[PDB]
PDB file of C-alpha atoms in Angstrom:
ATOM      1  CA  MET A   1       3.611   4.027  18.095  1.00  8.60           C
ATOM      2  CA  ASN A   2       3.496   0.375  17.106  1.00  7.67           C
ATOM      3  CA  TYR A   3       1.320  -2.348  18.582  1.00  9.08           C
ATOM      4  CA  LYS A   4       1.473  -5.753  16.937  1.00  5.23           C
ATOM      5  CA  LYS A   5       1.666  -4.494  13.373  1.00  4.13           C
ATOM      6  CA  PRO A   6       4.364  -6.017  11.156  1.00  5.08           C
ATOM      7  CA  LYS A   7       5.303  -4.669   7.746  1.00  7.23           C
ATOM      8  CA  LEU A   8       7.055  -5.795   4.585  1.00 10.32           C
ATOM      9  CA  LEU A   9      10.099  -4.323   2.885  1.00 10.23           C
ATOM     10  CA  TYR A  10       9.046  -3.291  -0.601  1.00 11.10           C
ATOM     11  CA  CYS A  11      11.539  -2.682  -3.383  1.00 10.17           C
ATOM     12  CA  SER A  12       9.808  -0.521  -5.963  1.00  7.35           C
ATOM     13  CA  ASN A  13      12.866  -1.357  -8.029  1.00  4.76           C
ATOM     14  CA  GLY A  14      11.304  -4.744  -8.673  1.00  4.11           C
ATOM     15  CA  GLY A  15       8.481  -4.958  -6.160  1.00  3.24           C
ATOM     16  CA  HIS A  16       9.108  -7.712  -3.641  1.00  2.00           C
ATOM     17  CA  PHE A  17       9.156  -8.314   0.095  1.00  2.24           C
ATOM     18  CA  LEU A  18      12.310  -9.047   2.055  1.00  2.00           C
ATOM     19  CA  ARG A  19      12.062 -12.435   3.722  1.00  2.12           C
ATOM     20  CA  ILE A  20      14.394 -14.250   6.088  1.00  2.00           C
ATOM     21  CA  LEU A  21      14.835 -18.009   6.127  1.00  2.00           C
ATOM     22  CA  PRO A  22      15.814 -20.103   9.156  1.00  2.00           C
ATOM     23  CA  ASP A  23      18.776 -21.239   7.091  1.00  2.00           C
ATOM     24  CA  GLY A  24      20.260 -17.764   7.284  1.00  2.00           C
ATOM     25  CA  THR A  25      19.086 -16.624   3.871  1.00  2.00           C
ATOM     26  CA  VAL A  26      17.572 -13.361   2.695  1.00  2.00           C
ATOM     27  CA  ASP A  27      15.695 -12.968  -0.568  1.00  2.00           C
ATOM     28  CA  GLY A  28      12.836 -10.952  -2.015  1.00  2.00           C
ATOM     29  CA  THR A  29       9.360 -12.220  -2.810  1.00  3.48           C
ATOM     30  CA  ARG A  30       5.990 -10.773  -3.744  1.00  6.56           C
ATOM     31  CA  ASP A  31       4.001 -13.610  -2.222  1.00  8.17           C
ATOM     32  CA  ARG A  32       2.125 -12.475   0.863  1.00  5.09           C
ATOM     33  CA  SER A  33       1.443 -16.160   1.396  1.00  3.79           C
ATOM     34  CA  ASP A  34       5.093 -16.508   2.338  1.00  5.68           C
ATOM     35  CA  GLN A  35       5.059 -17.131   6.071  1.00  2.00           C
ATOM     36  CA  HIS A  36       8.221 -15.262   6.987  1.00  2.00           C
ATOM     37  CA  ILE A  37       8.319 -12.075   4.948  1.00  2.00           C
ATOM     38  CA  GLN A  38       6.421 -10.743   7.940  1.00  2.00           C
ATOM     39  CA  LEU A  39       9.116  -8.746   9.694  1.00  2.00           C
ATOM     40  CA  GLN A  40       8.706  -6.583  12.773  1.00  2.00           C
ATOM     41  CA  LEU A  41      10.355  -3.182  12.574  1.00  2.00           C
ATOM     42  CA  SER A  42      11.218  -1.403  15.801  1.00  2.00           C
ATOM     43  CA  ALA A  43      12.981   1.798  16.789  1.00  2.00           C
ATOM     44  CA  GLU A  44      15.768   1.653  19.345  1.00  2.00           C
ATOM     45  CA  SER A  45      17.637   4.883  18.715  1.00  2.00           C
ATOM     46  CA  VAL A  46      16.983   8.151  16.918  1.00  2.00           C
ATOM     47  CA  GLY A  47      16.976   7.420  13.205  1.00  2.00           C
ATOM     48  CA  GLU A  48      17.577   3.780  14.049  1.00  2.00           C
ATOM     49  CA  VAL A  49      15.335   0.818  13.316  1.00  2.00           C
ATOM     50  CA  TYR A  50      15.591  -2.900  13.974  1.00  2.00           C
ATOM     51  CA  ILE A  51      14.530  -5.601  11.545  1.00  2.00           C
ATOM     52  CA  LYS A  52      14.019  -9.106  12.882  1.00  2.00           C
ATOM     53  CA  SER A  53      11.930 -12.110  11.911  1.00  2.00           C
ATOM     54  CA  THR A  54       8.993 -12.992  14.129  1.00  2.00           C
ATOM     55  CA  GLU A  55       8.766 -16.461  12.631  1.00  3.66           C
ATOM     56  CA  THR A  56      12.166 -18.006  13.245  1.00  7.90           C
ATOM     57  CA  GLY A  57      13.735 -15.450  15.554  1.00  7.01           C
ATOM     58  CA  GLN A  58      16.577 -14.058  13.477  1.00  6.47           C
ATOM     59  CA  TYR A  59      17.718 -10.488  12.955  1.00  5.63           C
ATOM     60  CA  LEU A  60      18.284  -8.868   9.580  1.00  6.17           C
ATOM     61  CA  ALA A  61      21.944  -7.926   9.385  1.00  5.03           C
ATOM     62  CA  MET A  62      24.349  -7.191   6.556  1.00  5.03           C
ATOM     63  CA  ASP A  63      27.655  -9.033   6.605  1.00  6.86           C
ATOM     64  CA  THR A  64      30.807  -7.808   4.907  1.00  7.72           C
ATOM     65  CA  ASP A  65      29.780  -9.507   1.686  1.00 10.46           C
ATOM     66  CA  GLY A  66      27.019  -6.922   1.526  1.00  7.75           C
ATOM     67  CA  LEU A  67      24.491  -9.739   1.561  1.00  6.33           C
ATOM     68  CA  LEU A  68      21.799  -9.970   4.212  1.00  4.76           C
ATOM     69  CA  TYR A  69      21.719 -12.765   6.764  1.00  4.04           C
ATOM     70  CA  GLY A  70      20.145 -13.758  10.059  1.00  4.59           C
ATOM     71  CA  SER A  71      22.329 -13.073  13.073  1.00  3.94           C
ATOM     72  CA  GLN A  72      22.260 -15.498  15.978  1.00  2.82           C
ATOM     73  CA  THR A  73      22.746 -12.635  18.406  1.00  2.00           C
ATOM     74  CA  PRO A  74      21.698  -8.973  18.477  1.00  2.00           C
ATOM     75  CA  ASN A  75      24.520  -6.945  16.977  1.00  2.00           C
ATOM     76  CA  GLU A  76      24.739  -3.356  15.796  1.00  2.00           C
ATOM     77  CA  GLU A  77      24.843  -4.969  12.375  1.00  2.00           C
ATOM     78  CA  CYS A  78      21.218  -5.928  12.884  1.00  2.00           C
ATOM     79  CA  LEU A  79      20.536  -2.288  13.667  1.00  2.00           C
ATOM     80  CA  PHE A  80      20.110  -0.007  10.676  1.00  2.00           C
ATOM     81  CA  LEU A  81      19.511   3.683  10.084  1.00  2.00           C
ATOM     82  CA  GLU A  82      16.234   4.721   8.500  1.00  2.00           C
ATOM     83  CA  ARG A  83      15.588   8.048   6.814  1.00  2.00           C
ATOM     84  CA  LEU A  84      12.981   9.777   4.683  1.00  2.00           C
ATOM     85  CA  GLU A  85      14.109   9.925   1.073  1.00  2.00           C
ATOM     86  CA  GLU A  86      12.464  11.693  -1.842  1.00  2.00           C
ATOM     87  CA  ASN A  87       9.954   9.948  -4.073  1.00  2.00           C
ATOM     88  CA  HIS A  88       8.113   9.085  -0.880  1.00  2.00           C
ATOM     89  CA  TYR A  89      10.311   6.169   0.117  1.00  2.00           C
ATOM     90  CA  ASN A  90      12.304   5.078   3.144  1.00  2.00           C
ATOM     91  CA  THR A  91      15.843   3.738   3.192  1.00  2.00           C
ATOM     92  CA  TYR A  92      17.965   1.614   5.497  1.00  2.00           C
ATOM     93  CA  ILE A  93      21.687   1.508   6.168  1.00  2.00           C
ATOM     94  CA  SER A  94      23.658  -0.859   8.370  1.00  2.00           C
ATOM     95  CA  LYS A  95      25.166   0.727  11.458  1.00  2.00           C
ATOM     96  CA  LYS A  96      28.415  -1.190  11.755  1.00  2.00           C
ATOM     97  CA  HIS A  97      28.437  -0.653   8.009  1.00  2.00           C
ATOM     98  CA  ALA A  98      27.005   2.837   7.713  1.00  2.00           C
ATOM     99  CA  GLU A  99      30.076   4.567   6.335  1.00  2.00           C
ATOM    100  CA  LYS A 100      30.127   1.777   3.776  1.00  2.00           C
ATOM    101  CA  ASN A 101      27.013   3.376   2.338  1.00  2.00           C
ATOM    102  CA  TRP A 102      25.150   0.090   2.099  1.00  2.00           C
ATOM    103  CA  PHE A 103      21.423  -0.009   1.448  1.00  2.00           C
ATOM    104  CA  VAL A 104      18.935  -2.836   1.831  1.00  2.00           C
ATOM    105  CA  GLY A 105      17.599  -3.282  -1.682  1.00  2.00           C
ATOM    106  CA  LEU A 106      16.654  -6.074  -4.055  1.00  2.00           C
ATOM    107  CA  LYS A 107      16.931  -6.671  -7.783  1.00  2.00           C
ATOM    108  CA  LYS A 108      14.133  -7.241 -10.266  1.00  2.00           C
ATOM    109  CA  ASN A 109      14.782 -10.965 -10.057  1.00  2.00           C
ATOM    110  CA  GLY A 110      13.830 -10.755  -6.399  1.00  2.00           C
ATOM    111  CA  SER A 111      17.428 -10.947  -5.238  1.00  2.00           C
ATOM    112  CA  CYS A 112      19.119  -9.034  -2.444  1.00  2.00           C
ATOM    113  CA  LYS A 113      21.227  -6.178  -3.757  1.00  2.00           C
ATOM    114  CA  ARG A 114      24.747  -6.353  -2.378  1.00  2.00           C
ATOM    115  CA  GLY A 115      25.348  -3.714   0.269  1.00  2.00           C
ATOM    116  CA  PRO A 116      28.453  -2.277  -1.408  1.00  2.00           C
ATOM    117  CA  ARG A 117      26.404  -2.038  -4.581  1.00  2.00           C
ATOM    118  CA  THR A 118      23.866   0.603  -3.627  1.00  2.00           C
ATOM    119  CA  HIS A 119      23.808   4.347  -4.177  1.00  2.00           C
ATOM    120  CA  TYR A 120      21.567   7.390  -4.398  1.00  2.00           C
ATOM    121  CA  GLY A 121      19.226   7.613  -7.364  1.00  2.00           C
ATOM    122  CA  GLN A 122      18.460   3.906  -7.383  1.00  2.00           C
ATOM    123  CA  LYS A 123      14.986   2.485  -6.897  1.00  2.00           C
ATOM    124  CA  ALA A 124      16.528  -0.321  -4.879  1.00  2.00           C
ATOM    125  CA  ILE A 125      17.394   1.730  -1.816  1.00  2.00           C
ATOM    126  CA  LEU A 126      13.959   3.321  -1.866  1.00  2.00           C
ATOM    127  CA  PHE A 127      11.913   1.025   0.339  1.00  2.00           C
ATOM    128  CA  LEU A 128       8.280   1.265   1.372  1.00  2.00           C
ATOM    129  CA  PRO A 129       7.172  -0.555   4.531  1.00  2.00           C
ATOM    130  CA  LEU A 130       3.740  -1.955   3.765  1.00  2.00           C
ATOM    131  CA  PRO A 131       1.345  -2.916   6.568  1.00  2.00           C
ATOM    132  CA  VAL A 132       0.815  -6.632   7.064  1.00  2.00           C
ATOM    133  CA  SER A 133      -1.209  -8.772   9.440  1.00  2.00           C
ATOM    134  CA  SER A 134      -4.408  -7.209  10.725  1.00  2.00           C
ATOM    135  CA  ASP A 135      -5.738  -7.613  14.246  1.00  2.00           C
ATOM    136  CA  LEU A 136      -9.213  -6.338  15.032  1.00  2.00           C
ATOM    137  CA  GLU A 137     -10.074  -4.933  18.441  1.00  2.00           C
ATOM    138  CA  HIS A 138      -7.638  -2.039  18.572  1.00  2.00           C
ATOM    139  CA  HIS A 139      -7.608   0.042  21.733  1.00  2.00           C
ATOM    140  CA  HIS A 140      -5.289   2.658  23.184  1.00  2.00           C
ATOM    141  CA  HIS A 141      -3.980   3.662  26.590  1.00  2.00           C
ATOM    142  CA  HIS A 142      -6.056   6.106  28.603  1.00  2.00           C
ATOM    143  CA  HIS A 143      -4.538   8.788  30.800  1.00  2.00           C
TER     144      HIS A 143
END
């Protein structure tokens, strides 16, 4: 399914990658150079994905402020629900804050869009995970 292949969180809305700082900050940026934007997405449960930084070691979670931050420990908050939305884009909603209808989006200024500030029809929720980091020599498991 996934073997050492990180991706970036695109926000067609503005067009930037979601990065996580070791200071517990989350902001967008369209600079591949940025050595952090590289996040590793994983699936734990059905329709559930995990976003954590492979640079510092923090997990992408949405507090009550709706803002994104790095959690010291693995909490359901770090776990989000991913689905296939129209326009050919994927979305993400916080578990602990799923009923809150919060989406991981960014503004055009490359700023995180408050959780309790997202809705359907916006180009902020629509996210496209782009492939990052390439590693030659790719083999598979044989029966």
